[PDB]
Amino acid sequence: SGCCSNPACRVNNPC
Amino acid sequence: SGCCSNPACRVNNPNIC
Amino acid sequence: SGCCSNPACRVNNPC
Amino acid sequence: SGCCSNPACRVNNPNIC
Amino acid sequence: SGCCSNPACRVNNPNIC
Amino acid sequence: LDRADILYNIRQTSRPDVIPTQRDRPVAVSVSLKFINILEVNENEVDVVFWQQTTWSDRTLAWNSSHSPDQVSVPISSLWVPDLAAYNAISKPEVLTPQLARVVSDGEVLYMPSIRQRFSCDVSGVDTESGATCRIKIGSWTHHSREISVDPDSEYFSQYSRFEILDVTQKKNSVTYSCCPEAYEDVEVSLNFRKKG
Amino acid sequence: LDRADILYNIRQTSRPDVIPTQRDRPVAVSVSLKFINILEVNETNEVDVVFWQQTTWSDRTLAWNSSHSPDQVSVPISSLWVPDLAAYNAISKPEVLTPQLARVVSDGEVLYMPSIRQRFSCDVGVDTESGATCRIKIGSWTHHSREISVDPENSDDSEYFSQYSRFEILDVTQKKNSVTYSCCPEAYEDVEVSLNFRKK
Amino acid sequence: LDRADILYNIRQTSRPDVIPTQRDRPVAVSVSLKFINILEVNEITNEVDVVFWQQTTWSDRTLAWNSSHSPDQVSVPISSLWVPDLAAYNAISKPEVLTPQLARVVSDGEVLYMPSIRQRFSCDVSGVDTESGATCRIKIGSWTHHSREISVDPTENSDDSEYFSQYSRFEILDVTQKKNSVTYSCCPEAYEDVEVSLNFRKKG
Amino acid sequence: LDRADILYNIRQTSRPDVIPTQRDRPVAVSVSLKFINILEVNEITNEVDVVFWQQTTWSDRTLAWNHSPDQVSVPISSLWVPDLAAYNAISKPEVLTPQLARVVSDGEVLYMPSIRQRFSCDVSGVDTESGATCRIKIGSWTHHSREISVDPTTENSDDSEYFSQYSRFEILDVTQKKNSVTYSCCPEAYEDVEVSLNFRKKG
Amino acid sequence: LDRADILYNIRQTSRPDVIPTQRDRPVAVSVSLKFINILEVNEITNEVDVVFWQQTTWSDRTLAWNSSHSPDQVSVPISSLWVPDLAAYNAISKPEVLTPQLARVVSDGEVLYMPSIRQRFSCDVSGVDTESGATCRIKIGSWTHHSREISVDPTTENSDDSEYFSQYSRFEILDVTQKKNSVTYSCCPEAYEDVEVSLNFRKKG
């Protein structure tokens, strides 16, 4: 997921 | 003018810069 | 024991 | 004034330095 | 006095060092 | 109200931990980087100095401007600030100037610190005609587009610098991933520069 | 509850010194290192790296009713308890480059991911085709497995690592090591991060 | 009456966030840089490492007290006082304060703060070995206030020094401090700064 | 009592400025240095940059409690710590690890930070087979033996199982000895722990 | 009174911002530098990195207590005490305190603070290899107070130059001199004091 490469996305979506 | 090149001017005039 | 080589073990078992 | 070369003297004498 | 070579001693004995 | 009254109110009702989301709409943060100097380029890190003009609205700070000052200078410790960070940063941002923001009677906050920071940018070809383009990715560290919305030669750059600015471009990038419903925003600052000759 | 109400409650009932152990069972801490850049390599056998440390755990005391309230809030780590994670082979103090904020979910889940610049003792090899391997041992500094349980993928490069870096990542493998010594009944856990890389 | 009372009053009525603008008149800030040492010159990236005393004076009438049967002056830590938001526009490093962060406050409300600052600047250090030397220009001013809130003034300035280190690798030729007041077409208020010109060369 | 109750009691009755001298007897401090890495050696300036675990143990009966946990992790800011300093130190000690100590129900405090510090040592002949023997003198900065008693956990003469295999240097022997000197001036004795690090270059 | 009682009293009646001037007489501050090591000498920048113990003593009568059935001395952190605003007027770096920031307070009100300081100074290091060596001048004094508020004194000591100096140092101490200079300017009635520390040293060979 491209989300995991983003800091705000990683913490907001528990990849 | 050169208000935007100045730090005190840029923050004092939001409408201009 | 290898406990002494570990920081968490050394302080928990007064090695 | 030699006072101006001293830090404690400068701050204590605003009229001189 | 060897005391004067020690930091703890120096501050503990102002009369000696 | 006088300056002392306005500053007391801001200090006493200070919620720097609370994001000023008004009517569930995101906080419109406007960022613009104005480059002052390019100090070191080493064989691949770049050490630069830049003014980060950051503007946003915090309606809770607002006051009646009638028979009162239109603007006040408030230390950022008393205000909420966006959690902006450069994703490609190698060093901690060093604030060189007094940590004060300008707050207008309408609740607008204007903070512009001078920052010295090192970045990961390919140093190969700095002496060449085209130079080397340095990409900087600024965005919120923990908030999504529904909480903080980010929006983007120089007449600020030092004449005494060893380097020369060719072009500075600042673009907004909004990406929505397949996993997640909320969009993710960032401001891509591309610094094109070369060594003087 | 609004964001201000949630943040006030967290701040007022803040126990950062208190480990959120829910009835004897350990705090399940999940750690994952995502390498962004390898800056300096010195031969001293040192390596200067920048990495994102994705740390997740549950703190049930922070939980709130998500009905007609935000699902998540951004809280500064000073208001929260954090695990005492440390790299055993670290030679430098970890330097946090990003805003010291964690994301807290309504169920009590804490997600903290700072960008850290740190130097490590590693066998640098670096110019060779096989590339030098750098072993990093992360674990709790004062708690055993019965208080804090550490957990880690074994591949990926990935989109994190800078294309403008002087070095190139070959493989990153994060493994859990649980050792129970003869002395002591409690087990001792650590996450071994193997970073094999080479010069371009 | 005594030092302890004066210091307690200053501490308790401390408003460091509040600019002491009396009757809507700006705060008259007087700045004067006295160069102590020039440590390093980077002819490559045009940098200069310098140590200087920043004599800053202003009036804060709210700090005033009756001098009759009371001390005329007291030493107050700057954390308890409002300080002007002065910054060097051409600064490349964070100003490092080397001395105790204390100001001298007079019974009339006058504040005299003079810290020793170690700072790096972007300067044309071309021909530092030459007889004419290099001229390093530093522009000081308020970071967020205009002339109607803070009025900056240079306190003569020519030529220095009795302050500069005799053991330094460099030699001061001339130090000039001038006030520059510019009013832009956009805006009615004027914008002030103090331009400090440091002419220096390498010794024999 | 639960962990929260124990930590609240420690925090509320916190006197880090107060030495826990029980019945006018000194605080028995036990120090032991475990070398992790030797980074830089400057034979020109006779300096050495090292990483070491400083195992410090002492008793603070005011922290004691007792169906409750046997041990808790307390931040050192909430506890009194001995004023230990290396007289032989050229740099400020840099604490690399979380500043937490382990407190046992009996009042025993176990603090073991990882410290990066530079020292003045005779690094002459580091490349030789005999190597260089770097000596460090640790002691209380302001207290005498009747207030704080400093003692070495080992002797040792043990090398290391904690020292990095990837280091450019190799440990030959580590020797920690207690030195108690009573001067003619003064009735109270003066103590220190002399650490002796024998090490050489691998080649 | 016990140690805890004495330390609580000092903490509660703590006025670190207030100079302990008794009967409008100045605070007699006694400063003495004891050199431990000379680390770096930079010929390019004309700098010197020195390690030294700064023995600072003064009296603060408000800290005094009855020594009868009570400890004679206690260790107090300097954050709870008033300290003189001493500075090297010619220093190029911020003084780095290497040791625990604790002072020794005697029952009579005497404060003895002796931190180990690592600091850089402006030094003409040309001819450090020569027989005569190089001399470092450190001018120590109060940053904001005059002689009528803080008086500064170097002590009668002159026979300890190398008593604390590391044997493993690359440099060697030749002569250490700490003299008191009292100058009264024509402008002003109050005298101005400073302690001039001269450190003469050379490279070993």
Numbering used by the authors:
A (entry chain I), C (entry chain J): 1 to 14, 17
B (entry chain G), D (entry chain H), E (entry chain F): 1 to 17
F (entry chain B): 1 to 43, 46 to 154, 161 to 205
G (entry chain D): 1 to 43, 45 to 125, 127 to 154, 157 to 204
H (entry chain E): 1 to 155, 157 to 205
I (entry chain C): 1 to 66, 69 to 205
J (entry chain A): 1 to 205
From the manuscript:
Neuronal nicotinic acetylcholine receptors (nAChRs) are ligand gated ion channels involved in the modulation of neurotransmission in the central and peripheral nervous system. α-Conotoxins are a large family of disulfide rich peptide antagonists of the nAChRs isolated from the venom of marine cone snails.
Interestingly, LsIA R10 forms unique hydrogen bonds with AChBP Q55 (3.2 ± 0.11 Å) and Y164 (3.2 ± 0.26 Å) on the minus face of the ligand binding pocket. In addition to the interactions of the variable residues, unique interactions of LsIA N12 with Q73 (2.9 ± 0.05 Å), R104 (3.2 ± 0.07 Å) on the variable minus face(16,37) of the ligand binding pocket were also observed. Regardless, hydrogen bonds of LsIA N12 were consistently observed in all five binding pockets, suggesting an important role of this residue in LsIA activity. In the LsIA/Ls-AChBP co-crystal structure, LsIA N6 interacts with AChBP Y185, which is conserved across the nAChR subtypes and therefore not expected to influence subtype selectivity.
